[PDB]
Amino acid sequence: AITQERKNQLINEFKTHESDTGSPEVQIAILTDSINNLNEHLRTHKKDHHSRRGLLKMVGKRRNLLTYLRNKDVTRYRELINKLGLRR
RNA sequence: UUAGCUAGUUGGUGAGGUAACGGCUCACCAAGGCGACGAUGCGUAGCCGACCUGAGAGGGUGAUCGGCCACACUGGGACUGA
RNA sequence: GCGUAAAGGGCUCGCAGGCGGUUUCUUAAGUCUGAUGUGAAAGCCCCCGGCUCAACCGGGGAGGGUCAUUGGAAACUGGGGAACUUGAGUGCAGAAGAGGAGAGUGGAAUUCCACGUGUAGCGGUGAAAUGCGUAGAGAUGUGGAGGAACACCAGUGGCGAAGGCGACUCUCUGGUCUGUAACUGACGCUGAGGAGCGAAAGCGUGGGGAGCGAACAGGAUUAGAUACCCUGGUAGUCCACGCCGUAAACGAUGAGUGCUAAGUGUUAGGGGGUUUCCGCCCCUUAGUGCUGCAGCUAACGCAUUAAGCACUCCGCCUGGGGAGU
RNA sequence: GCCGCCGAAGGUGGGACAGAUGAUUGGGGUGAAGUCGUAACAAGGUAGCCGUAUCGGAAGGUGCGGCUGGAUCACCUCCUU
RNA sequence: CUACCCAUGUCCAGGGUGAAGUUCAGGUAACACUGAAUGGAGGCCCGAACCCACGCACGUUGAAAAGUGCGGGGAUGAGGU
RNA sequence: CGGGACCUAAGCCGAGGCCGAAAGGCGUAGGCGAUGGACAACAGGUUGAUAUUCCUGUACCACCUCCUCACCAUUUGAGCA
RNA sequence: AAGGAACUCGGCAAAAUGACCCCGUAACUUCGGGAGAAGGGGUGCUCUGUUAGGGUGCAAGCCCGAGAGAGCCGCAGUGAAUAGGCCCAGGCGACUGUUUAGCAAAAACACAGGUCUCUGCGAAGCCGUAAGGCGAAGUAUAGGGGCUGACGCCUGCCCGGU
RNA sequence: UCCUAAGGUAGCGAAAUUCCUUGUCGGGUAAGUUCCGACCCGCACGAAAGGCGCAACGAUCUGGGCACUGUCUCAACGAGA
């Protein structure tokens, strides 16, 4: 992926500022959903090591941004984590 | 080419004990605690002021004098007494 | 210190750890400084005196601490709060590729088979022989089966972390660079362990076996031929599922960042000068090749893709054999 | 005086670790003078080397992939003129 | 009778060992993975009824033309009946 | 109550049928054949001898109507089915 | 008694060990074991004490009871009967099983696994003189035949003979 | 060097394979014609008439120890048939 309905749809459903395309909660949202769909799409044919290395790098980047948002705002980071679902 | 260790062990309460806190020792309760910042285990060794050497940083020894610890044929024990 | 002498981990992802853009208020945790305590004596050093001097003795000093207690400075590292944007990330629009995984399809060529046509050789070599051929071979014509690899484009081209990746089409997917520049506001760099991938040979099972082909068979060359050569030929190569985790895994150069003469190629882009075109030329990135200044060096050589110049971090090196035993 | 608690030495047991010594045997070192080859350094007589697999009295051979640390053409990039 | 088959019934006292599988807690990005509890499969283990027939002794014109007494193996299966 | 006036398993017999000197071998439709499936009764007494049988109280099973009632319908049909 | 395998081809045979609870348990491995490994300690009774705590019950009441402290007595505390003796090191065979009823249970045979081979189904082999039927209401991942016997490492050379 | 088609490779080896033989050496013993370990002279091992190792199991087979005993040194009482 991600589909445009989830790129603009997910950024529209999780926009932190009114015109903020970034806002690292938004980067954790788009990178998180794209990492999930890349997780099933990697699991569909479990031999492709190239796409797997992409899944490891992407999931690691989403983890580093998750720790960054956790260090940037405590309660908002807990609300973004418990709202998103992952990190548990 | 030692990653396990620990069960009075980790901690509580209670009692006893000694000059004195303390699992110091026991009863009862809990399941703790230490570890890559090296636990435990093997090895070696009294440590220090200092001495010798080096331009200095460092490297080596703990003789003789002194300060503390230990031991008194080997291994326990308690009495007298401050 | 590590391109060639010993020394870059095969390569990546990441936790702990180590290090970190600019402005501003506080702090003293480090950093630094003043006061007290204490660092016993003897000893080392400085300054005197006494044994005829000296060794020595004695007196007078000094110095020795991530040391405590305590007072200041806030420049720098850090703690905390506020900030900002090039770093890094998201967005928007472009570009590109043999990056990967799965399915399907297509030819050229070799083998084999069936039948026609035809005869006496085919084959191989340095020269021959083994082998095949009158059971009709080679060649040639037609058709069928099956496997493996895709010629031309194709190139010190492209992509990928590396090993590596090539016929064509589709699904699913990662990544790179360019361009303004909407947002975020340091969210980064490395990273021992740990995790993961890693040619070819192998290893287990089950498939597949057209070519190639260790071991093996025969003939040749030689004094000898357990080799070179030729004729054959098993495993393997192929596939799927698992283990193997080594290579001259090479650029014998770890990653990241900043700077420092130039020229000439070459893809992937962008801005532009006029240009409807086209095309030339400049500026610009990114990637990659050659030629070379400074600088490095033992010499070869490297040289904006450094082995230059500095910073962060990891790994490796301490004569050879013994012995990677 | 008797009895209870713990208590050293000792005994019993199964372990662990370390050192001596052991018929033989494996690799290595050094050396008498030795017997077999000529593998490697020239294109070293088949270019080596690296990893792996098998075979060989042995240096080694051969297969697979990789590298030039490859003598050298001859394509060839694209080098100074 | 016995060897085998086929059809249909029946028997196997009690207690242990603990897997696969699950659930929970931890764990990764999901897996993996790890531990607790749950779990009862198995020609598993012990051992009686039962079946067998390895020891020994006896008996040997025997209680008996194959047994008896002490012991013994199997004892949810390839089982006995 | 066990068994037959119920059914069937391996098997057996088997009209017709098929093969084969003969005798017979096999086998269809059929039928037999429990160790199976279906299935209504029980608690006491009792003798020198029989019992979920005799007997004393309850029951149960199927069939049929000299009888009694209840309810339908008269083939535009109760019911057997 | 005392000595203990000197008897004997041979510890044949007897003697011995044994029940629970607890501690503790090696080499080796296929990671499950081995292993009831080995080697040890406790148990009888009285009281505290209708113990602690459970099952059951409304209470009453029974049952089921660890754990301990005091104390008793004996040579002896699962006092009796029935309940494993172990531990090294070898050869063979993976194993549990099966066989010579009535001498030989074993190192024999079986066995999963491994292979070589045949067979396309009115079948290969079967029993039949044939009919019929097994194989089978099976279909080359299935049947029949042979060889060898888990597992691990392998399975070297000769097609002259037959 | 002669012959065959080829001359047995690995791994084992005085084994259930070995006659000379009790092959030689070492361990175990006081003394070990069996046993364990290796040397290889394999009379007459050897790779699916499998070779070689192999935890678990044997009513197998064979050495060696602990405990324990009438197995005996050497028997002697006592109870039943």
From Swiss-Prot:
Basic and acidic residues composition-biased segments: 1-20
Region of interest (Disordered), ranges: 1-23
GO cellular component, one term: cytosolic small ribosomal subunit
Cross-referenced InterPro entries: Ribosomal_uS15, Ribosomal_uS15_bac-type, uS15_NS1_RNA-bd_sf
SMART domains assigned: Ribosomal_S15
Any single Pfam family the record assigns to this protein: Ribosomal_S15
A Gene Ontology molecular function term of the record: rRNA binding
GO biological process terms on file: translation
Cited Gene3D superfamilies: 6.10.250.3130, S15/NS1, RNA-binding (1.10.287.10)
Record keywords: Ribonucleoprotein, Ribosomal protein, RNA-binding, rRNA-binding
Quaternary structure note: Part of the 30S ribosomal subunit. Forms a bridge to the 50S subunit in the 70S ribosome, contacting the 23S rRNA.
PANTHER family in the cross-refs: RIBOSOMAL PROTEIN S15, BACTERIAL AND ORGANELLAR, SMALL RIBOSOMAL SUBUNIT PROTEIN US15M
Family per similarity comment: Belongs to the universal ribosomal protein uS15 family.
Cited function: One of the primary rRNA binding proteins, it binds directly to 16S rRNA where it helps nucleate assembly of the platform of the 30S subunit by binding and bridging several RNA helices of the 16S rRNA. Forms an intersubunit bridge (bridge B4) with the 23S rRNA of the 50S subunit in the ribosome.
The protein's name: Small ribosomal subunit protein uS15
Organism name: Bacillus subtilis (strain 168)
Gene coding for it: rpsO
